[PDB]
Paper text:
The two selected adaptive proline mutations (P41, P104) indeed occur in loops of ctArx1 preventing unfolding. Another fundamental concept in thermo-adaptation of proteins is an increased bulkiness of hydrophobic amino acids within the protein core. Direct sequence comparison of ctArx1 with cgArx1 indeed shows that 80% (16/20) of the hydrophobic amino acid exchanges lead to increased bulkiness. Acquired electrostatic interactions are found between the imino-group of W357 and D124 (β4) linking β4 to α3 more tightly and between adaptive R350 in β13 and E154 stabilizing β13 with respect to helix α3. Mutation of F146, W357 and R350 reduces the thermostability of ctArx1 by about 2°C to 51°C. In addition, mutation of the two hydrophobic residues (F146, W357) on top of the five adaptive mutations leads to a further decrease of ctArx1 thermostability to 47°C. Taken together, these examples of adaptive mutations in the context of the 3D structure of ctArx1 illustrate how individual residues and their interactions contribute to a thermophilic adaptation. By solving the 3D structure of a single thermophilic protein (Arx1 of Cth), we could identify three different types of adaptive mutations : (i) loop rigidity by increased proline frequency, (ii) increased protein core hydrophobicity, and (iii) increased electrostatic interactions stabilizing neighboring secondary structure elements.
To validate some of these predictions experimentally, we applied them to a protein from C. thermophilum, which is homologous to yeast pre-ribosomal export factor Arx1 (Associated with Ribosomal eXport complex). To reveal mechanistic roles for adaptive residues, we determined the 3D structure of ctArx1 that shares the pita-bread fold with methionine-aminopeptidases and Ebp1.
Author numbering: 12 to 383
Amino acid sequence: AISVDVLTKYKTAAQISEKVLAEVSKLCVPGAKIIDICEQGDKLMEEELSKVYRDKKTNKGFSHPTTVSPAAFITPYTPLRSDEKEAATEIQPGEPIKIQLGAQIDGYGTIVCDTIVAKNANDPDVIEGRQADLFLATYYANEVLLRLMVPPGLLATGTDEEKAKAAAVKPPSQAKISSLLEKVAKAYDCNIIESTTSWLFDKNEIEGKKKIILSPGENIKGEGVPEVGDVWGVEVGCSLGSGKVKQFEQRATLHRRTNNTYALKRPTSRKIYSEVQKKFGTFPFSLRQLEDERDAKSGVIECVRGGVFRQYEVTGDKDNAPVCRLLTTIAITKNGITRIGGPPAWDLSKFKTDKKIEDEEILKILEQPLSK
């Protein structure tokens, strides 16, 4: 069981992340410059952070930089101010924008990601066409995934014999999880984004010792099963295209410190390394967050080459089609699955399409509860 102390720190992080997410989503209007939004989000996060756990030397910070990703972007986007062309990128109207960010208290982080439609306050709320399909695929993929993560039998009802039959059912393989989510996307003629990964979280860790990898494809596979006591960053992504991923040309700015001990030779490497250890610890950060972009670009090179920073390469839809993503931080307890921190529920009434999930296996899963 997760202690009150730990659960409460995750929860403090979630409330901060959800509040910053809401403030950042309001800034995502057509014409807004992405770099301004990320900077403002990061600023908000720090303000919110300074308003809690003030007493004592309680560590705290970002679990994830504010990122704002256009239509076909998969890697969370957070560009440099000194990259003139990138830093002038503006929100395009009607595009699906991924906003992913998060906070961190005493090494317990919550990461959240919502996808919204870029628009002005007095634009219509309705989403239609294949864009409605893209969103609904992602929504239902998420609802299905979350239910596939409830440990077998935890919430089974009925006779003792039914309850025992449920608890003795093996946790679904990751291949089975994948094919079901693919089925969900297909009902909307969308595809799951290859290798979309959910990670176990732990103290100072957002890429823990268990992970679920959706539609792995080839020489890749996830390992580990969700258990009562776990906290997970649960992610789903869909594409109006094939759901294939490809490297784009924007500068990689998203990184995180690893636990590798490689000795850095270059002084700007060590300098940036120490700056990051102190501010972010082992949590993801954007190069734009560092004190000096020129130092950032110089030192990051050896840090990545040496394996002490992990670099998250810039990727986007291989077909250059729009993508949709959700990321929820959950807790698994006695009572099932609780969403500690995530995106605000979507009003399904706003989505307009003829498409519908018809597969019986999937509709049945959707009837299963997430918790008691």
